[PDB]
Amino acid sequence: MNKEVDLSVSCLGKVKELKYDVIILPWGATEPHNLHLPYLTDCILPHDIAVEAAELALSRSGVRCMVMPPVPFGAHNPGQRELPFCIHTRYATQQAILEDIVSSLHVQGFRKLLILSGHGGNNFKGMIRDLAFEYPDFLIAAANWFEVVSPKGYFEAEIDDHAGESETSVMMHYHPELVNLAEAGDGESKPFAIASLNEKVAWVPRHWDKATVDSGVGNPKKATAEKGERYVKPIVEKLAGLFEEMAQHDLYE
Amino acid sequence: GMNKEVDLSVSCLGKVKELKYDVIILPWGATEPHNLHLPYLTDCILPHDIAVEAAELALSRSGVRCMVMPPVPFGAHNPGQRELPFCIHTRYATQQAILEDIVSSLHVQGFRKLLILSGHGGNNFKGMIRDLAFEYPDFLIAAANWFEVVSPKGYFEAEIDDHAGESETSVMMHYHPELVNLAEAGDGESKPFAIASLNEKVAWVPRHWDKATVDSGVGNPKKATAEKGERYVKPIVEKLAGLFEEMAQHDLYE
Amino acid sequence: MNKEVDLSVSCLGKVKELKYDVIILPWGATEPHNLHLPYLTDCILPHDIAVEAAELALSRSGVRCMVMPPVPFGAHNPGQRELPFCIHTRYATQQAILEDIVSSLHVQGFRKLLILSGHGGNNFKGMIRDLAFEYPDFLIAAANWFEVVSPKGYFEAEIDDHAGESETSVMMHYHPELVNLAEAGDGESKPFAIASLNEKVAWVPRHWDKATVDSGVGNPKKATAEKGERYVKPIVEKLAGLFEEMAQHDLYE
Amino acid sequence: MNKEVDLSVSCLGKVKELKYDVIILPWGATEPHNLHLPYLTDCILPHDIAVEAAELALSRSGVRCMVMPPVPFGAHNPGQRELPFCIHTRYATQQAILEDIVSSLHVQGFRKLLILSGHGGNNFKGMIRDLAFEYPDFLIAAANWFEVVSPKGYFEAEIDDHAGESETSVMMHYHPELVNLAEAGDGESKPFAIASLNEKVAWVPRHWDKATVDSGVGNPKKATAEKGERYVKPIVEKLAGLFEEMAQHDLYE
Amino acid sequence: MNKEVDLSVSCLGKVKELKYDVIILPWGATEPHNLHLPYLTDCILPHDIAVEAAELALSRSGVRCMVMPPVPFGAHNPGQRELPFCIHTRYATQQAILEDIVSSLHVQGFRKLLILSGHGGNNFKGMIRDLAFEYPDFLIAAANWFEVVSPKGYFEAEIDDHAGESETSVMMHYHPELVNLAEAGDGESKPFAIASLNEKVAWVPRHWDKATVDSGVGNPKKATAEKGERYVKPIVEKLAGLFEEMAQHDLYE
Amino acid sequence: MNKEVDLSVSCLGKVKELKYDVIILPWGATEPHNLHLPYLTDCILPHDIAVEAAELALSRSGVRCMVMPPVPFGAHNPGQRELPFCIHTRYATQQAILEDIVSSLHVQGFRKLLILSGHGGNNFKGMIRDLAFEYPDFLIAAANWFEVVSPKGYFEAEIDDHAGESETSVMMHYHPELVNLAEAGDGESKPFAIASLNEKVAWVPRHWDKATVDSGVGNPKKATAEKGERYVKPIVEKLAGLFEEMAQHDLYE
Ligand SMILES: [Ca+2]
Ligand SMILES: [Ca+2]
Ligand SMILES: [Ca+2]
Ligand SMILES: [Ca+2]
Ligand SMILES: [Ca+2]
Ligand SMILES: [Ca+2]
Ligand SMILES: [Ca+2]
Ligand SMILES: [Cl-]
Ligand SMILES: [Cl-]
Ligand SMILES: [Cl-]
Ligand SMILES: [Cl-]
Ligand SMILES: [Cl-]
Ligand SMILES: [Cl-]
Ligand SMILES: [Cl-]
Ligand SMILES: [Zn+2]
Ligand SMILES: [Zn+2]
Ligand SMILES: [Zn+2]
Ligand SMILES: [Zn+2]
Ligand SMILES: [Zn+2]
Ligand SMILES: [Zn+2]
Ligand SMILES: [Zn+2]
Ligand SMILES: [Zn+2]
Ligand SMILES: [Zn+2]
Ligand SMILES: [Zn+2]
Ligand SMILES: [Zn+2]
Ligand SMILES: [Zn+2]
C-alpha cells in the first residue's frame, strides 16, 4: 500500500503538502478475459504497473507522480457486449470522462498527464488532439502498457492478443489470488472470411461471437508468475524514465 | 472474503457464465477528499462493501443472486472542491452518458433490474432514470444512497455529520481499518451561509467547500469506532437484502 | 397587473431605469392534474406566489425582483407522456434552457437567481452544480414552492401528492375561474408491489398508467380557496425574506 | 376563455373525450419591443390568432384544434442579449424543445402539428427536416403569423420590422390593457455600412446595439386597434382554412 | 486554374506571403439533380461563381479573397434520402462543421466569412446567430448564389426549383463536359393536396417520392450555355462588389 | 472521367439502374503539405486510387463500387491550426458526418463501406465500433492508402511522413498540373525534448510550429511521377482485391 502515489488508497492528509509533477491515469475496461482472468484485468494491470513506475521515478530521481483510480469504461467489439457484465462505452462517453478529469486537474494546477491503457480497444489520439486546442498548456500523452516492451523472449505463445500468456502471467505476478490458470480455456480464435482483412489491407473489428469460443484470444497455458515479473520490470523502467523526462523537460526546448 | 459469485471486481467469466442473476447493483461513488484521514475513494468503497454483503445475505437467505458491478468513481461536486488536489467533478451529462452505456449493455445481456447504490450525496439520478424509463420501458432502475437506508441518528454521537464525519469514518473503520488513521483527522469544523433562509432550507444552494470547511470534512469524526460502524451497517445490509429479494420476486406493479 | 415585477405583463419602458436585485424563474410543467385543474397549474402557482413575494419584498424592504415568464417544460414519469398534451422534457433539454437563461441574464449584469419550481418531477441540483463552475459569480438557488412551508396541518387529505387538496386550494385562491372542484375525481392511487420501494429504501418513479385513474394523486374534495389563502401567506413571507437576504448578503461573510 | 382549444386554460376533464385533428404550437420570444410593447408580444400574438382561428375552424367545419402554450424561447441578434430580460435561445435548445414536444404528441397519437411563430428570428425548417426522418408519419408545418397576409395596404409606416405599426396595432386590438402607445419611441434604425448587405445580396444579422435606440425597428406612432382588427381578420380566416385542409387531406393525394 | 483564390488547387507556397481580406465558403449538397446533372452540382456552381467573383474583386479593387473547398453536406427532404448516394446532413452536423471551420479561421486571424450556398435546403441564419455570440469579432454572411439575381427574366421555364433551366444552363456554361442535356427528364412535379400549403400560408417540405418522377423540379430542356453565361455575369459582379465592401468597411461605421 | 464509379462526376441517370456492391468513402484533410503540394492532397490521392481500384474490380470481376466525394475534414495537430486555411475537425464532428453518411447509405440498401483515408491524423476505429452496434448489418472497414504497401524499394528518402517523396511522387503521377516540385522545401523536422516520446514509449502529437519549418516532414526532392506510378500499381491491385472480397464474402463464413 502506497498513499504517496496511489490515489486508490490515499487521503488528503498524505498528499496536501507534497508536490506532484505528473498525473497518471490508468484506463481499462470491464470485459471478460477467457474464463480465468478478472473482468477488471485491463484496469488492475496498468494500475499496478503505474504505481511501480511512480515508486521508481520517486526513489530514482525525486519525481513524484500520482496514479489516479483506473477508468473501467472501455470500447468493445461486436459480440462482446452480449457477454454478461461486459460494458461497452461509446467514444463520446469516454471523451466526456477525460474532459471532466482534465478540467479538474487543470484547475488544480496540474499540467502533465499520461493515460496508461490496459485495453487495446481504447484509442485516445483524437481526444488528445481536441484537448490540445482547449488546454494548450496541458500535456497529455498516451500508451498501452503492453506495447512498451515487445513480448519476444518473454513469452512462448505466438498468438497472444487478449487474456493470453502475457496478461495471465502479469496477473499471476501482481495478484495470484485473482487467477486460477487451471480454469483457462485454450483461447482458440478464428480469422475473417475476407482474406484482405486478415492480411491487414484494411481494418474491421473482430466479432467475438464468431472469432472466439471462451472470449480469450491466445492460449494462456504456459503463463507463470515469474514470466510476468520479468516482463514488467523493463516496462516499469521505461515508464519511470518517461515520467522523469515529462517532469524535467518541456515538450520542445 | 473474496466472492466471485456476487463481486464483479474480483470475478471472472468462468464463475459467472452458468449462473442466473436476478438483480444488478451499481455502486456509484466519487473521487473526493474526506477530511484528512479517509480515502479519496470512500464513496466508492462503502457502497461496494455494503452491496456485496447484502448480495451475500440475499443469496444465502433466498437464493436470489445479484451482481455487484465495479464502483463508478465519477461524482458531482461543489464549488471549492474541484480545486482540491485529485478531486474530479463530473458533469451530469457525463454521468448520464455513463449510465446510458451501462444500461444499454446490461439490456442486451438480458438483464432488466438495476439498483444504483450511491455513496455520494452530490449524485442525483432521478432525471436520468426518468429519461431511461422511456428508452428502456422494460428495464427497472432504482436509486438509493446507502446512508439513507437507515438514519444515522441514534447510531452516532456527533450532531453535525455530513461528510467524512463520525458515521463515514466508523463504517470505514469497520470495513477497511487499514485505510483510516483516525489520529490524522481534523475536527471537520463547518461554517453556515450568511443568508439565513438558505440555512433554514427555504431554498437550496450548494455549500462552497472553500468558504465552509477547513480540512474538507463536515463533522467531527473523532468519536468514530469500528463497532459503531458494524452496528449501523447491520440494518442497512438487511434492508437492502430485502429490496434485492423483492425486486427479484415481483414486478413493480402486479 | 404589475409591470414592475412581472415580466409576463411588462415592457422595456417600465423596467429600463430600475435596478433589479434578484431574478425569479418560475418553472412548471404541461401536465394533466386530475380532471379539474389546469394543464398549466405548475406554472401558474409558482408565478403567482413569486409575484406576491416580489411585491412584499419591494414594499417591505425596497428590494426589487423580476419574475420571469414560467418555463412550461417539466420532467415526467412513465404513463404520463401518453396522456393527451402532457409534454415530457428530457433533463438535457431542461439544462439547455437554463444555460441559455443564465447566459443571457449574466450578460445583462445579473448575478442572483432563484428557480421557483411548481413541479416536483423537476430536479435542478445537477444543473446548478455545473453552472457554478461555468459562472462562479452567479448565485442560483432552487426551491419547490410547496416545500417552503409543509402542508401537514393546512390540509385534511392524508395523501396529497399531485392535484390534491393543497394544489386545488391554492388554485381556488388565485384563479377560482380556472378550477371547478365538482369536476374532480377522487385521485385514488395504487402503491408498488415491491414493499421496500413503498417504504422508500430505494426510489423508482410512480407509473401513472398503473398508479392513477384520473391522473390525480390524492383526494382534492376538501379543497377551499380559504385554505389556499392561509397556506400561501407564510410561503410568500418566507420567500420575500429569502429575496431580501439574497439582495442584502453575500453567500458567505 | 375556451377550454376546448386553448390548453393554457384547459383541463383533462374538458379535453379527454374529444377528438383533436391539428395541434398548433405558438412559438415566440422573450424580447423587448420598443418601450411600449410587452416582452411576451411574440407569444401573445400568435397564441391569440391561433385560438381565434381554432374557434373559427371548429364552428364552421367541426375541425377541432388544440392550441398548446406558447414557447417563450426565441433566437436573437447581436446586441439584444445585453438588453435586460431578453433571452437568447440557441438553435440546439430550440430543437431539443421541439423534439420533446413532438415525441410526446406522437405517443399520444397526434400526427399533425403547426408551429405558428411570432418571432422572425426563429427558423424551423432544419428541425422539421430532421424530424421528418425520425417521425415520417408526423406532419409538421411552420408559419409566421405576420406573413400569412402581407401588411402592404393595412398600415402606413414603410419600415415596420419589430414592435412597429402592425405588431402594435394587433396588440391594441387583442390586449389594449398591455400596451400604451404614447410610451413608444420612434423605432429609428440604422443600416449597415456594407451596401450590398442593405441590398440583400447576402444576409448578416442586424446588430441591435448599433442599429436601434429604443429596441424597436419601425415607427409605431400610427397604430390603432381598428387597424389591428382589420389586418387579423384575413389572417384568422386563412389559418382556419389551413387547419381544415390539414385535418381533411393527406399531404399528397 | 487559380492558386491565388481557389484552395482546391492552391498550396502553402502560393498563399503564405499574401494578405487575404475575405474567406468564401461554398456549401453544397450531394444530391440527385434530375437524370442529367452531377450529384455535386450544388458544390460546383457556387465554387465556380465564387472563384470568378474573387478574381474580379482582385483585378478590379486589389481585394484578395480565398475560396475554400466546397462542403458537400446538405440538408434534404423526405423521399430524397432513399435515392442512391443522396446524403442527408443533420442541422447539428452542419453546425459542428461550421464551428470547426470558424474556430480554425479565427485562430489564423481571419475575421470575415461569406457562406455561398448552392442548395436551398441549407439554412445558416441560426448557426450565424449562435456563432455571433461565441465569436463577436467574426463577421459571417450567407447567400444562395441563385438568389443574388432573380432568375425570372433570364430563363423561360415556369418552374425552376431544382435541376431546372437555370442550374442546367449555368452548368453547361462552366462544365459542359459534366452534362448531356439529351439525358434530362421533364422534371414534372406534383403539388400538395393541402391548398393552403401550395399557397404558402405555411411551409412543409416537398416529399420527393410523391412530388417528382426523375428527381428534378422544373423542365430544363430549353437550357443553354449562353443563358447560363448571361445569368452568372451579374451574379459574379454583385458578389465581387460585396467582397470589396466586406473588405473595406466595418459592418457599421 | 467515369460516371459509373466516381460520384464527383456522376449523375442519377448513369447510376439508377446499376447494382452497387461496395461504397468507398475517401476521407482527407484540408492541410498545408510543404510549400508545393495541394491543400487537398489527402482527399485527391485516396480518391484517385479508389477510382482506379473500383475500375479494376469491375473490369476484372464485375464487382461494382461507388467512390463517394472525398470528405475534406481532417483531425490536426497543435501548430497546424494556425497555418492559413488549415481546418481542424473535432472527432465528434467527424463522427456526426460518418453517422449521416451511413444513415443515408443504409436507407438506400447498402450494407458495405470502406473508408479510405488520405490523412494519418484520421482515426476511425472508435466510430466504427459505435456504429457496429447501431447498424449491426452494415460492415465498415477503414484503411490508410499509404499503408497498403511499404515504401521500401519504391522511394529513397528515409523520413517521409508528410508531403514527402511518396505523396509528392503520387501527386506528380495523378495530377502533375497541381504540383511543381521546384517549389518544395526540404521538409526538415525536429524531435521532442522528451527522449521517451521520440522512442515511442508513449504518444503525444508533434507540434507543427516547433517540429517543421515549411509544414512538410520529409525531403520530397527525389520525387518523380514514375515512382508514383510504380507505387500505386500494387496499392490499387490490393484494394481492388479487398473490394471484390467484400462484395463476394460475408465477414465470417
Ligand atoms: Ca461462437
Ligand atoms: Ca529511459
Ligand atoms: Ca425488508
Ligand atoms: Ca424569514
Ligand atoms: Ca455593387
Ligand atoms: Ca516555428
Ligand atoms: Ca488480393
Ligand atoms: Cl454484442
Ligand atoms: Cl479488433
Ligand atoms: Cl450541498
Ligand atoms: Cl415519482
Ligand atoms: Cl436580422
Ligand atoms: Cl421544400
Ligand atoms: Cl503526430
Ligand atoms: Zn485485457
Ligand atoms: Zn481488453
Ligand atoms: Zn463520503
Ligand atoms: Zn461524497
Ligand atoms: Zn402540479
Ligand atoms: Zn406536476
Ligand atoms: Zn415581436
Ligand atoms: Zn421578435
Ligand atoms: Zn442544385
Ligand atoms: Zn440542392
Ligand atoms: Zn498528406
Ligand atoms: Zn495529412
Give the chains touching B; criterion: ≥3 Cβ pairs < 8 Å: A, C
Q: Which residues pair with F113 in a beta bridge?
A: F23, F140
Question: How far is it, in rounded angstroms, from Cα D61 to Cα D244?
Answer: 7
Question: How far is it, in rounded angstroms, from Cα B73 to Cα D242?
Answer: 56
Amino acid in position B86:
F
Burial of A107 (0-12, 13-18, 19+ CB in 10 A): middle
Q: Are A5 and A65 in contact (CB under 8 A)?
A: yes
Question: How far is it, in rounded angstroms, from Cα F122 to Cα A115?
Answer: 20
Question: How far is it, in rounded angstroms, from Cα F91 to Cα F69?
Answer: 20
DSSP B159: S
Query: CB-based contacts of E233: which residues, under 8 Å, 6+ apart?
Result: none
Distances (CA, A) of B155 to B168, B173, B234, B235, E3: 12, 15, 11, 11, 80
Q: Are A119 and A31 in contact (CB under 8 A)?
A: yes
Distances (CA, A) of E154 to E37, E158, E219, E231: 20, 12, 15, 6
Mark D91-114 as b/e (b = at least 16 C-beta within 10 Å).
Answer: bbbbbbbbbbbbbbbbebebbbbb
Q: Which residues of F are annotated as a binding site?
A: 31, 33, 42, 119, 167, 209
Q: Are C14 and C5 in contact (CB under 8 A)?
A: no
Tell the residue number behind the cell numbers 465477414, with chain if given: F251
Give the CA dihedral D30, D31, D36, D37, nearest 10 degrees: -50
Q: Are D60 and D17 in contact (CB under 8 A)?
A: no
Question: How far is it, in rounded angstroms, from Cα B123 to Cα B28?
Answer: 8
How distant is the Cα of B99 from the closest Cα of chain A, in angstroms?
10
Q: At what angle do helices D125-134 and E91-108 cross, to 10 degrees?
A: 130
Query: Which set of grid coordinates corresponds to residue E230?
Result: 448571361
3-class secondary-structure state, position A152:
strand
In order, the DSSP letters of B12-46 are BHHHHTTS---EEEEEE-----BTTTBBTTHHHHH
Question: How far is it, in rounded angstroms, from Cα C220 to Cα D51?
Answer: 30
B208 is in an annotated binding site: no
Amino acid in position C132:
A
Phi and psi at B206, nearest 5°, equal -70, 140
Query: CB-based contacts of B103: which residues, under 8 Å, 6+ apart?
Result: B114, B132, B136, B139, B141
Question: How far is it, in rounded angstroms, from Cα A111 to Cα A105?
Answer: 8
Query: Which set of grid coordinates corresponds to residue E114?
Result: 461569406
Chains D and E touch (3+ CB pairs under 8 A): yes
Kindly state whether residue C32 falls inside one of the protein's structural domains.
Answer: yes
Q: Are D24 and D57 in contact (CB under 8 A)?
A: no
The alpha carbon of residue A244 and the mean position of all alpha carbons in its chain are separated, in whole angstroms, by: 19
Burial of B49 (0-12, 13-18, 19+ CB in 10 A): buried
Burial of B181 (0-12, 13-18, 19+ CB in 10 A): middle
Give the number of C-alpha atoms closer than 13 A to the C-alpha of residue D88, restricted to the C-beta side. Answer: 24
Question: How far is it, in rounded angstroms, from Cα F161 to Cα F208?
Answer: 12
Question: How far is it, in rounded angstroms, from Cα F126 to Cα A120?
Answer: 11
Of A129, A190, A238, nearest to F205 by CB-CB distance is: A129
Kindly state whether residue D162 falls inside one of the protein's structural domains.
Answer: yes
Give me ligand 4 centre to Cα E32, in Å: 68
How distant is the Cα of E198 from the closest Cα of chain D, in angstroms?
10
How distant is the Cα of E96 from the closest Cα of chain F, in angstroms?
6
Chains F and C touch (3+ CB pairs under 8 A): no
Tell the residue number behind the cell numbers 495523378, with chain if given: F174
Question: How far is it, in rounded angstroms, from Cα E116 to Cα E141?
Answer: 9
DSSP F74: B
Q: Which residues of D touch E76 (CB under 8 A)?
A: 129
Question: How far is it, in rounded angstroms, from Cα F49 to Cα F32?
Answer: 21
Q: Which residues of D touch C69 (CB under 8 A)?
A: 30, 39-40, 43, 72
Tally C-beta pairs within 8 A across E and F: 162
Question: How far is it, in rounded angstroms, from Cα C231 to Cα A179?
Answer: 65
Please count the residues of chain E. 253
Phi and psi at A38, nearest 5°, equal -60, 145
DSSP C160: E
CB contact under 8 A, E11 and F96: no
Query: CB-based contacts of B38: which residues, under 8 Å, 6+ apart?
Result: A11, B164, B168, B169, B172, B179, B180, B221
- From the list B237, B73, E32, E21, the residue with the least C-alpha distance to F13 is E32
Tally C-beta pairs within 8 A across A and F: 159
Q: Are E94 and D41 in contact (CB under 8 A)?
A: no
CB contact under 8 A, D104 and C90: no
How distant is the Cα of E252 from the closest Cα of chain F, in angstroms?
27
E209 is in an annotated binding site: yes
**Nearest residue of chain E to residue D148 (CA atoms):** E201
Of B67, B104, B179, nearest to A85 by CB-CB distance is: B67
End-to-end CA distance of chain D: 37
C245 is in an annotated binding site: no
Tell the residue number behind the cell numbers 470575415, with chain if given: E112
Helix locations, chain A, DSSP H: 12-15, 41-61, 91-107, 125-134, 165-174, 195-198, 208-211, 225-248
Distances (CA, A) of D119 to C77, C96, D116, F22, F155: 32, 20, 9, 47, 63
Other beta carbons within 10 angstroms of residue B56's beta carbon come to: 18
Question: How far is it, in rounded angstroms, from Cα C147 to Cα C234?
Answer: 12
CB contact under 8 A, A139 and F204: yes
Q: Tell me the helices (H) and strands (E) count for chain F, helix number first.
A: 8, 6
Strand E22-27 with E65-67, pairing: parallel
Which listed ligand is nearest to F78 at the C-alpha?
14
Give me ligand 8 centre to Cα F142, in Å: 21
Q: Which residues of E touch F73 (CB under 8 A)?
A: 97, 100
Other beta carbons within 10 angstroms of residue C62's beta carbon come to: 10
Q: Which residues of E touch D126 (CB under 8 A)?
A: 75, 91, 94, 123, 126
Q: Which residues of A touch B39 (CB under 8 A)?
A: 8-11
How distant is the Cα of B40 from the closest Cα of chain C, in angstroms?
20
Q: Which residues of A touch F203 (CB under 8 A)?
A: 125, 128, 141-143
How distant is the Cα of D1 from the closest Cα of chain C, in angstroms?
9
Q: A27: part of which helix (H) or strand (E)?
A: strand A22-27
CB contact under 8 A, E8 and F40: yes
Query: Which set of grid coordinates corresponds to residue B211?
Result: 468558504
Amino acid in position E49:
I
What strands lie across the sheet with F65-67, from one edge to the other?
F65-67, F22-27, F112-117, F139-144
3-class secondary-structure state, position F143:
strand
Burial of E200 (0-12, 13-18, 19+ CB in 10 A): exposed
Other beta carbons within 10 angstroms of residue E137's beta carbon come to: 7
DSSP F212: B
CB contact under 8 A, E69 and F72: yes
Measured over the CA atoms of residue B166, residue B171, residue B172 and residue B177, the dihedral's sign is positive
Return left, alpha or beta for F139; rule: phi > 0 is left, psi -120 to 50 is alpha, else beta. beta
Residues D91, D96, D98, CA angle at the centre, nearest 5°? 95
Query: CB-based contacts of D79: which residues, under 8 Å, 6+ apart?
Result: D207, D208, D209, D210, D211, D212
Amino acid in position B45:
I
**Nearest residue of chain E to residue F15 (CA atoms):** E84
Other beta carbons within 10 angstroms of residue F113's beta carbon come to: 24
Choose, out of A98, A129, A213, the residue to mutate when testing the contact with F (most F CBs < 10 Å): A129
Distances (CA, A) of B235 to B66, B151, B152, D143: 19, 10, 11, 62
Q: Are F131 and F140 in contact (CB under 8 A)?
A: yes
E31 is in an annotated binding site: yes
Query: Which set of grid coordinates corresponds to residue B11?
Result: 470475478
Residues A51, A56, A58, CA angle at the centre, nearest 5°? 95
Residues A184, A190, A195, CA angle at the centre, nearest 5°? 155
Give me ligand 13 centre to Cα E42, in Å: 16
Tell the residue number behind the cell numbers 423542365, with chain if given: E219
Residues E71, E75, E77, CA angle at the centre, nearest 5°? 145
Please count the residues of chain D. 253
Strand F65-67 with F112-117, pairing: unpaired
Q: Which residues of F are annotated as a binding site for Ca(2+)?
A: 209
Tell the residue number behind the cell numbers 449562435, with chain if given: E130
Distances (CA, A) of E71 to B111, B196, E122, F118: 44, 57, 11, 18
Q: Which residues of A touch F207 (CB under 8 A)?
A: 251-252
Return left, alpha or beta for C85; rule: phi > 0 is left, psi -120 to 50 is alpha, else beta. left
**In CATH, what number is assigned to the domain containing residue C69?**
3.40.50.10310
Give me ligand 21 centre to Cα D232, in Å: 15
Strand F22-27 with F65-67, pairing: parallel
Burial of F1 (0-12, 13-18, 19+ CB in 10 A): exposed
* Number of structural domains found in chain D: 1
Helix locations, A5-146, DSSP H: 12-15, 41-61, 91-107, 125-134
CB contact under 8 A, B92 and C129: yes
How distant is the Cα of D3 from the closest Cα of chain E, in angstroms?
26
Burial of B39 (0-12, 13-18, 19+ CB in 10 A): buried
Question: How far is it, in rounded angstroms, from Cα A72 to Cα A29?
Answer: 5
Which listed ligand is nearest to B209 at the C-alpha?
10
Task: Give the per-residue SS3 of chain D.
Answer: CCCCCECCCCEHHHHCCCCCCEEEEEECCCCCECCCEECCHHHHHHHHHHHHHHHHHHHHHCCCEEECCCECCECCCCCCCCCCCCCECCHHHHHHHHHHHHHHHHHCCCCEEEEEECCCCCCCHHHHHHHHHHCCCCEEEEEEHHHCCCCECCECCCCCCECCHHHHHHHHHHCHHHCCHHHCCCCCECCCCCHHHHCCCCECCCCHHHHECCCCECCCCCCCHHHHHHHHHHHHHHHHHHHHHHHHCCCCC
DSSP E167: H
Other beta carbons within 10 angstroms of residue C193's beta carbon come to: 15
Query: Which set of grid coordinates corresponds to residue A67?
Result: 496514479
Q: Which residues pair with B114 in a beta bridge?
A: B24, B141
Experimental method: X-ray
Kindly state whether residue E38 falls inside one of the protein's structural domains.
Answer: yes
Q: Which residues of A are annotated as a binding site for Ca(2+)?
A: 209
- From the list C48, C54, C93, C102, the residue with the least C-alpha distance to C70 is C48
Please count the residues of chain C. 253
**Nearest residue of chain C to residue D106 (CA atoms):** C82
**Nearest residue of chain B to residue A89 (CA atoms):** B101
Kindly state whether residue B4 falls inside one of the protein's structural domains.
Answer: no
Of F34, F38, F72, nearest to E9 by CB-CB distance is: F38
- From the list F131, F160, F116, the residue with the least C-alpha distance to F28 is F116
Kindly state whether residue E2 falls inside one of the protein's structural domains.
Answer: no
Kindly state whether residue C6 falls inside one of the protein's structural domains.
Answer: no
Give the chains touching D; criterion: ≥3 Cβ pairs < 8 Å: C, E
What strands lie across the sheet with B66-68, from one edge to the other?
B66-68, B23-28, B113-118, B140-145
Kindly state whether residue E22 falls inside one of the protein's structural domains.
Answer: yes
Tell the residue number behind the cell numbers 394543464, with chain if given: C39
Give me ligand 14 centre to Cα F206, in Å: 4
Q: Which residues of A touch F81 (CB under 8 A)?
A: 133
Kindly state whether residue E41 falls inside one of the protein's structural domains.
Answer: yes
Tell the residue number behind the cell numbers 423508482, with chain if given: C204
Strand D112-117 with D139-144, pairing: parallel
3-class secondary-structure state, position A32:
coil
Give me ligand 4 centre to Cα C252, in Å: 18
Strand C112-117 with B23-28, pairing: unpaired
Q: Which residues pair with C115 in a beta bridge?
A: C25, C142
Question: How far is it, in rounded angstroms, from Cα D140 to Cα D132?
Answer: 8
Q: Which residues pair with E160 in a beta bridge?
A: E218
Distances (CA, A) of A179 to A31, A37, A159, B9: 15, 6, 20, 13
CB contact under 8 A, D210 and E251: yes
- From the list A164, A142, A170, A168, the residue with the least C-alpha distance to A49 is A170
**Nearest residue of chain B to residue C201 (CA atoms):** B149
Question: How far is it, in rounded angstroms, from Cα D125 to Cα D175?
Answer: 31
End-to-end CA distance of chain C: 37
DSSP E38: B
Residues D90, D95, D99, CA angle at the centre, nearest 5°? 155
Q: At what angle do helices A91-107 and A125-134 cross, to 10 degrees?
A: 40
Distances (CA, A) of D70 to A86, D26, D243: 46, 5, 18
CB contact under 8 A, D90 and C100: yes
Range of the domain at F79: 11-249
Distances (CA, A) of B4 to A39, B1, B18, B59, B117: 10, 10, 13, 13, 19
Resolution, given in Å to one decimal, reads 2.1
Give the chains touching C; criterion: ≥3 Cβ pairs < 8 Å: B, D
